[PDB]
Structures are given as C-alpha cells and as structure tokens.
Amino acid sequence: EVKLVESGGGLVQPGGSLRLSCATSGFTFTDYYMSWVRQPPGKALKWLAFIRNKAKGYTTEYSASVKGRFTISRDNSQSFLYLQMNTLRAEDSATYYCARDINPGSDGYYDALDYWGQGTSVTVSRAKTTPPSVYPLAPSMVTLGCLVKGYFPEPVTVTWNSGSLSSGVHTFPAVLQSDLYTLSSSVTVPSSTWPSETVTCNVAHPASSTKVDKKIVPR
Amino acid sequence: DIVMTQSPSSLAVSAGEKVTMSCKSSQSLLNSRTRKNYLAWYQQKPGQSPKLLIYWASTRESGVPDRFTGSGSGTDFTLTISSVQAEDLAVYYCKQSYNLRTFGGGTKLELKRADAAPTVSIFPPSSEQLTSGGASVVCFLNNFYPKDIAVKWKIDGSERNGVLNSWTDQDSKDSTYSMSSTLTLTKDEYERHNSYTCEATHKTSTSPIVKSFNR
Ligand SMILES: C=CCO[C@]1(C(=O)O)C[C@@H](O[C@]2(C(=O)O)C[C@@H](O[C@]3(C(=O)O)C[C@@H](O)[C@@H](O)[C@@H]([C@H](O)CO)O3)[C@@H](O)[C@@H]([C@H](O)CO)O2)[C@@H](O)[C@@H]([C@H](O)CO)O1
Numbered sequence: 001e002v003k004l005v006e007s008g009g010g011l012v013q014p015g016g017s018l019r020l021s022c023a024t025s026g027f028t029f030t031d032y033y034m035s036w037v038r039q040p041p042g043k044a045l046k047w048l049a050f051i052r053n054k055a056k057g058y059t060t061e062y063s064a065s066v067k068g069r070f071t072i073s074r075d076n077s078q079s080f081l082y083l084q085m086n087t088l089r090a091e092d093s094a095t096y097y098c099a100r101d102i103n104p105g106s107d108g109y110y111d112a113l114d115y116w117g118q119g120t121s122v123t124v125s126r127a128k129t130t131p132p133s134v135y136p137l138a139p140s141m142v143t144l145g146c147l148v149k150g151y152f153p154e155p156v157t158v159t160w161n162s163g164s165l166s167s168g169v170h171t172f173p174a175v176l177q178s179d180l181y182t183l184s185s186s187v188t189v190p191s192s193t194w195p196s197e198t199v200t201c202n203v204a205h206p207a208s209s210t211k212v213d214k215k216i217v218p219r
Numbered sequence: 220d221i222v223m224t225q226s227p228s229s230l231a232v233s234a235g236e237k238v239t240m241s242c243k244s245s246q247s248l249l250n251s252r253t254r255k256n257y258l259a260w261y262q263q264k265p266g267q268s269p270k271l272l273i274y275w276a277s278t279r280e281s282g283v284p285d286r287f288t289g290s291g292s293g294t295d296f297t298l299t300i301s302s303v304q305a306e307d308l309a310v311y312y313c314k315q316s317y318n319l320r321t322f323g324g325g326t327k328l329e330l331k332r333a334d335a336a337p338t339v340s341i342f343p344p345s346s347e348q349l350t351s352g353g354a355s356v357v358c359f360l361n362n363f364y365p366k367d368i369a370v371k372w373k374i375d376g377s378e379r380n381g382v383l384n385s386w387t388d389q390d391s392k393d394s395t396y397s398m399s400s401t402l403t404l405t406k407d408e409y410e411r412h413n414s415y416t417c418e419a420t421h422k423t424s425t426s427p428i429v430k431s432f433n434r
Pocket residue numbers: 052056102104105111250252253257316317318319
C-alpha cells in the first residue's frame with residue numbers, strides 16, 4: 001500500500017523558518033513527481049510546489065505565493081520529501097499535505113494527485129505555547145465529556161477509552177479566545193455502563209508534548 | 220496564472236437526490252495532442268485529507284462509486300452525483316494540472332434531512348478546575364437539524380458574556396449537527412449563585428429546552 005506521512009509541523013514566530021518532512025513508501029519514490037499542498041483552517045486547498053522525478057532531473061516549481069520563500073527537495077536514498085519554509089507569516093498558518101504526483105514516463109500515467117498524507121499543522125504566531133488543562137464533564141442514556149481548555153497552538157487529539165469508545169462521540173471544533181484555544185468532546189453511553197464501567201478521555205497536545213488521561217467520575 | 224472558479228459555494232441536497240456542481244478555468248485545459256483535459260476532482264470530508272475522485276475531467280478513479288461522474292471540456296466542467304448519500308457530505312475541489320496546479324475554491328455539499336430536536340445536557344465545573352480558581356459550565360446540544368439554534372445562559376434566573384459556542388461538522392451517518400456552549404466564570408463568581416440554566420431554542424419546538432443544576 002502507498003503511504004505518505006508528514007511531520008515537522010508546530011508553532012513558529014512571524015519571520016521565522018521551519019522545515020517540513022514527508023516519509024513515503026509502497027512505491028518507487030524516484031519514479032514520481034511530489035507536491036506540497038496547504039489549507040488554512042476553514043479555507044480552500046492551495047497547491048504550493050512540486051519536484052519532478054528522476055527522468056526529469058528532479059527539477060522544481062513553485063506557486064507565486066511561496067516562490068523565493070519556500071524550497072522543495074527530496075532525499076531519494078530514503079524516499080523523503082522536504083519543504084523548507086522561510087520568512088513565515090500569519091497567512092502561512094495552515095495544515096500542509098504532501099501528495100504523490102505524476103509519473104509521465106509510465107504508459108499508465110495519468111495526471112492527478114493520487115495519494116495524500118494526513119497533513120501536518122503549522123501556526124505562525126508570536127503567542128506562547130501553552131498546554132491544555134483537561135477537565136472531566138459529568139452529571140436511558142448518559143452523556144459525559146472532557147473540556148480541553150486554554151491551550152496553544154492547535155491541534156490536540158481526543159480519544160475515549162484509548163479509541164475503544166468511538167460511537168456516540170462528538171468532538172467540537174476548537175474556539176480561539178485571547179491567544180488560547182478551548183474545545184470540548186462529548187460521549188454518550190448506556191446508563192448501565194456508567195459509573196459501573198470506567199470512561200476515560202485521552203488528550204494529546206503535540207506542541208507541549210502533553211499526554212493526559214482523565215477518568216470521568218460522577219458528581 | 221490559471222484561475223479556477225467553482226459554483227455553487229454551497230448547497231444542501233436530500234439523500235437519494237441528484238447533485239450538480241460546476242468548475243470553470245480561465246483558459247482551456249485541453250492538450251491538443253492527446254485531447255486530454257487536465258482537470259481533476261477531489262473530495263474532502265470533514266477532518267479528512269483530500270481524496271482523488273476524477274481525473275482527465277471524466278475518468279473515475281479506481282474505488283470511486285459509480286454515482287460520481289465528471290464531464291465537460293475546455294473551460295467548463297461538471298461533477299455530478301446521482302443518488303447522493305449521507306456519507307457524501309464534503310467539500311469538493313476541482314483542480315487544473317495543465318500548467319503547474321491550481322485548486323478551485325471548492326463547493327460545500329451538505330445534506331438536507333428531517334427536522335430533529337436537540338438532546339441537551341448541562342455540566343457544572345469540575346472540582347479540579349474550581350481548585351485552580353476557574354469555573355466553566357458546559358452545555359451540549361447534540362444531534363439536531365437544522366443547524367440554526369440559539370442558546371441562552373441564565374444564572375439565578377437572570378440571563379448572562381463569557382460564552383463561547385462551537386458547532387460540529389454535519390454527521391456523516393445521520394446528517395445531524397451538534398453544538399457546544401461554554402460559560403466561563405471565576406470560582407468566586409461561580410460560588411455567588413445557585414442556579415445555572417442552559418436554554419436551547421430550536422424550530423423543532425415552540426418551548427425552549429431547559430437544562431439546569433443547582434450549585
Ligand atoms: C511541445 C510538445 C510537448 O510535449 C507534450 C505535449 O504533447 O504537449 C507533453 C509531454 O509532457 C511531458 C511528458 O514527458 O510526458 C510531461 C510534462 O509534465 C508537466 C511538467 O513537468 O510541467 C506536468 C503535467 O502535469 C502537465 O502540467 C504538463 C503540461 O501540461 C505540459 O505538457 O507539464 C512536461 O514535463 C513535458 C516536458 O515539458 C517535455 O515536453 O513532458 C510529452 O507527452 C510529449 C510527447 O512525449 C512528445 O510529443 O508531448
């Protein structure tokens with residue numbers, strides 16, 4: 001199976017630099033052009049750059065929006081794609097995807113971005129990294145939740161019982177206020193499984209390397 | 220500079236119905252040699268990465284349901300979904316690859332369904348938060364339709380600043396929305412009053428849904 005995994009995303013100050021990376025496998029890396037694409041929260045996809053394959057001599061191209069500021073490159077020995085970003089600004093805040101681009105030299109060639117990574121998030125801001133506080137929300141069925149309050153930057157991840165509980169989960173999009181995000185997550189289970197059975201929310205905040213497990217106890 | 224534009228910006232369709240969306244390029248994407256149009260369609264579901272649906276304007280990517288069809292040529296292209304399904308909720312992007320790549324602004328497809336009343340739950344501040352001097356009161360309004368909804372916070376009978384709301388994306392299976400409302404107070408302020416009330420007003424009833432607790 002083809003696999004693409006971005007990394008390198010985090011918080012960076014206005015004017016700063018940051019390099020993203022993209023690990024790939026499941027296909028012959030050098031046969032393919034590779035692209036970076038970004039998407040600011042709530043906005044459209046934006047193609048940024050590509051780097052051609054070996055047959056094309058690995059030449060590069062950029063959108064006018066990042067030309068002269070960003071650099072795309074590839075390490076063919078271990079099949080990595082890179083994006084060096086300099087002179088970053090708020091408008092550059094976004095999730096960045098790497099995508100497998102074309103192979104013109106194949107008879108089966110067709111023109112599209114046929115595989116995408118999960119994306120890595122980038123925030124350009126002077127504001128400080130702040131870990132979340134994670135609070136339990138407890139009162140036929142019963143609804144519980146976790147409040148993930150006052151963190152920066154995005155993102156965080158929330159699971160329930162290590163992902164075992166995934167049905168009847170609602171994670172509400174974060175809301176920014178005074179340089180800090182807050183988000184909540186709800187879960188609904190049968191009244192017979194709580195409190196008689198443990199319910200725990202698991203919260204991670206990569207930028208502060210925070211890992212939290214919070215059990216929901218009645219009260 | 221190839222400018223890509225899509226239409227409509229958004230729309231809502233009932234399950235089972237046909238959906239049509241448009242994409243325009245500022246110039247032809249047609250290779251005269253091959254007569255291939257360098258126009259692709261991508262689907263992006265809430266919280267997911269973009270996924271290839273159609274390329275060469277009309278070629279369905281392997282694994283894509285038959286209900287998805289791409290057509291058009293030159294500067295005008297269409298994506299058609301027959302029998303839209305609840306899971307089709309997404310933003311759809313067209314993209315030219317004739318000269319580098321350029322995405323359109325996207326079409327947001329939402330799903331129309333029968334009106335559904337919210338299930339409302341209120342939650343008092345946790346003791347762990349109170350210990351640090353803060354006091355957040357949370358209200359969940361889950362599984363309703365349509366999206367439009369009002370939340371009223373009342374403390375000791377008096378409506379209440381300090382309120383932040385957040386709506387989920389539409390649900391992929393039941394096409395409902397949910398919404399969270401958080402009233403953040405200081406502990407000192409929280410301890411001054413007894414009754415905390417979350418009032419939901421939705422078209423599904425003439426009477427507000429009222430959830431509350433006493434401190
Ligand atoms: C004047 C004739 C040029 O070449 C073509 C033609 O019919 O126009 C196209 C050839 O296109 C390729 C190839 O090696 O197959 C691939 C091209 O790729 C890219 C690019 O690298 O910028 C990316 C694509 O997604 C697409 O945007 C195309 C453009 O639409 C232009 O084709 O560009 C590109 O790398 C060219 C390269 O410039 C050399 O032509 O090559 C190729 O099919 C030839 C054919 O082999 C001989 O006629 O026709």
